[PDB]
Ligand binder design. Structure first.
Ligand code: P1T
Ligand code: P1T
Lengths: 468, 468
């Protein structure tokens, strides 16, 4: 029915949490997993991450103890999502925001915190926690150098795990009806795993809690698991640190699973492809850990995995196939790039132009009157023409006639005004996979040497694939 | 409480809709608006847009009439969000997706539909609806050329407005308790405004419904309002077309408001800044139309505005200040760029280096053993040093000591391994606003002519601002 959103909300802070739980049946059937893999889709909060909760939570504590007055400044070291949550809380309740984040993190987090009126100081990636050039040391320096400033310190504030123990874990319990067999959850500050695992083990002691730690971090138990890539920097954002945060109670977690970059990203793309959950990379790490840890489970049992982050924060980073190819990561089992590699292979546009059958595409200087160009088009019997300057684009008779009827194309007007201006350049040595990726962004694809041989669209490639 | 998400969900299709309504008090107080401006945050659906609903909806109709079997292909012309919704439905229920979208639309929509296993054919921006190079004409051609393909045709399918009449309008009614005085809603295909306005006027006849149409479109009534920029292409995505779609009942809408690009984008950024709703540009258009139309309303009355789209689809486009400066759009009344322009003005780093007070920053060839570099650092009494090749980065004694303790820095190892590798180049003629924007992405900022004068961080700029 409708209980929680059935009224009007006072601010965006009231739209945090209350996240649905979805059964990933298709993904389980893909990976050959017998049990029910439930996903807590924390990326669907108003701010698009689980950390929103603690952001809100901490401010509430700072307000329930009277420690915070209007106009104050908030400083917080973060990998990006807590900065967003605290920035939301500050823009709503009238506080000043300063974020300290490492250079490793994405630019979308930075831009979104900038739209929320927050100052952004970035710190070097390779700095240790002890360095005063660390995000935490720089935040401490800013607290020392700024008046009416406060560091809420999500690494040591009890609100961070207390709210995952109060509401989120209670959410997971009430939607799974108490029956939980495994919980796989990423270990960043460790607040989410601590709080959720504690509440669940209190209400369901037979539940195993699995912590996910990236290869490079030192949070897993024992240290014989962390020595794969000791303190080697990784790309996944959100989990793992070079120290044990104050809120992390590693004794409440039973197992530890090590997950690397390649597995995390390919499984995140698998989640998007097979379930349709616009999810982040750390959630790929958590789901890979869950698929490895819950392999021994049976049907009927429920393994709950946290999906912390939304794709919005890594929209240019790993959603783009260009960047995952530049970082040498296997795209996915079933993906568009591998599909194009399978169908096209090494076929180049030379092969298509040869199999179809003289580069006699008419050309005009792009400032002809439309009357002269239609006379040339009717005398040459071709339908399309290419306009270029001393390249401009393509121009069809259909658009000519319809825009003359529409009141957009004058008789004495230059053909530059009505030609199609979005184009993509190619050359015969190019493969067909690359022209398909180019067709993802541009309607036409034209060749050159300046002697162009023709125009290439998606239906031409479909016809070529039909000949195979 | 918890009614709708209190269980486990079968797929992401069940997480569509059920969107909360938030009162934009801060934004109303900013613009000087007396009434309650309620926002239906359709961008919080699982797919991040209102169109998810109709996407789901249409498939359901196509399944309830038995017209759709497993393995079929779905073709759909879209500005991007319906393509996403239908791609979600296809990935869940096992259908093949082909999207036809104009080149005007963002690349995030394309990439996200590619991650959902959908083929993407793009069409020219300037093409009219009649052209067979139009998104609709190309979709028709693909339907003619492909077997087991179906076009659900959101422009003419009754599911599109029927579901906004069945659930979404009923949602708005049940959360506003029947009392609605104005509804401002964007006119794209017109399905959302038709359905919602019809249901609301049926349940509350005293309600005015305001349609928003971008300057360039021909959907507003009368035509004396559309002649600002007749058929001139615009940047906002989602609303307005060169024809009246089949589902648009322009007689059920009372007013029409014309909103241009500049107003839409600056108001979208204002929404993000003042309310903290990660919202899209079309929602800026709708909110600007609402602020203009509901100006005559009183406190107590409720003006409901639709927020169709999520910022995720325009993350690189208009969230980035670079692109809004390149398109000559006023950033916002209160924004970080204008704040930096106010505090810094025309001050260049020459002025800061002069006011602070000899460019004697030590340099090393970036392959010295750490022992030699620490001896040089102790003999020069400086703390930081700059490593460069035949630029590499910066290197501090704090990181030296802590990483030697950490097991990451050998005695005979080269200083390249432990130096900070993320850097930003500047030159003395650069303004301070530009170095602040650069500091949004990089921890340090160093100058050059190759003679570097020093390193610049955020605390240095804070100190300079403290001297003013
Ligand atoms: C460390 C931070 N985030 C934690 C996090 C996590 C781990 O959540 P924890 O509450 O820190 O255990 C997983 N995924 C993402 C994307 C995350 O951002 C932060 O916001 O400073
Ligand atoms: C036209 C399409 N979207 C409609 C839309 C609208 C208008 O919604 P309509 O249901 O078409 O009236 C507003 N904002 C955005 C971002 C939109 O995408 C489409 O998905 O093809």
């Amino acid at each position: 029915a409708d209980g929680p959103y059935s009224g009007i909300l006072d601010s965006v802070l009231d739209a945090i949490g209350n996240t649905p739980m979805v059964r990933m049946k298709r993904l389980a059937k893909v990976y050959g997993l017998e049990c029910d893999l439930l996903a807590k889709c924390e990326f669907m909060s108003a701010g698009g991450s689980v950390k929103d909760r603690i952001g809100k939570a901490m401010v509430e504590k700072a307000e329930r103890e009277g420690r915070l007055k209007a106009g104050d400044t908030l400083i917080e070291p973060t990998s990006g999502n807590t900065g967003i949550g605290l920035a939301l809380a500050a823009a709503v309740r009238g506080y000043r925001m300063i974020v300290t984040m490492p250079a490793k993190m994405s630019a979308e987090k930075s831009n979104i915190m900038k739209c929320l009126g927050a100052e952004i100081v970035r710190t070097p990636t390779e700095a240790a926690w002890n360095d005063e050039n660390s995000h935490m040391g720089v935040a401490a320096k800013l607290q020392r150098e700024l008046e009416n400033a406060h560091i809420l310190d999500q690494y040591n504030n009890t609100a961070n795990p207390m709210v995952h123990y109060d509401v989120t874990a209670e959410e997971i319990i009430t939607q799974c009806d108490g029956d939980i067999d495994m919980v796989v959850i990423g270990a960043g500050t460790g607040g989410t795993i601590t709080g959720i695992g504690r509440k669940i083990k209190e209400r369901c002691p037979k539940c195993k809690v699995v912590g996910v730690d990236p290869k490079g971090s030192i949070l897993a138990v024992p240290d014989s698991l962390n020595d794969e890539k000791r303190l080697q920097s990784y790309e996944v954002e959100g989990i793992g640190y070079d120290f044990v945060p104050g809120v992390l109670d590693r004794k409440v977690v039973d197992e530890w699973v090590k997950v690397g970059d390649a597995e995390s990203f390919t499984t995140a793309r698998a989640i998007i492809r097979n379930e349709g959950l616009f999810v982040g990379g750390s959630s790929g790490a958590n789901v890979w850990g869950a698929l490895q840890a819950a392999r021994q489970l049976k049907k009927g049992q429920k393994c709950v995995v946290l999906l912390p982050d939304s794709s919005r924060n890594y929209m240019s980073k790993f959603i783009s196939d260009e960047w995952m190819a530049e970082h040498g990561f296997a795209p996915e089992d079933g993906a568009k790039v591998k599909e194009r590699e399978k169908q096209f292979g090494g076929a180049r546009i030379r092969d298509l132009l040869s199999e179809t059958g003289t580069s006699d595409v008419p050309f005009v200087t792009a400032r002809l009157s439309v009357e002269d160009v239609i006379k040339m088009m009717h005398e040459t019997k071709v339908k399309e023409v290419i306009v270029t300057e001393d390249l401009v684009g393509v121009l069809s008779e259909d658009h000519i006639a319809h825009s003359l009827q529409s009141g957009r194309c004058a008789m004495q007007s230059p053909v530059k005004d009505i030609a199609f201006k979005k184009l993509a350049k190619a050359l015969p040595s190019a493969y067909l996979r690359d022209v398909a990726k180019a067709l993802d962004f541009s309607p036409y694809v034209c060749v050159m040497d300046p002697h162009f041989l023709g125009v290439i669209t998606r239906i031409d490639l479909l016809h070529w694939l039909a000949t195979k």
